[PDB]
Fold Bud emergence protein 1.
Amino acid sequence: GPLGSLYAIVLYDFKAEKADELTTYVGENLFICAHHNCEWFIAKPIGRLGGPGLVPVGFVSIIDIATGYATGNDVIEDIKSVNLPTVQEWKSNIARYKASNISLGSVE
């Protein structure tokens, strides 16, 4: 129901090929930072001070908090849920805005 934070799950170990590509690990948990052509994703691991990076969609799945299954949904639908801005629209926001604070709710 509530949105504002989207995440994905690595079902396969990705291998950074590009010069800005990032490597991943199979059966891993991570969150998308952006999406390109609803084909590529802007990964951003914390395990290491770096990222973000480009990752394949076939190597990541979107699912809600649970054991780890596929309901049959898609990332695109989740992209419009978390207003997941395209890597192109993100890069545009980068160096555009400045660290700020926004209203936040509260509920145990």
The first strand starts at residue 8 and ends at 10. Residues 87-93 form the longest helix (7 residues). Helices lie at 75-79, 87-93. The chain has two helices and five strands.
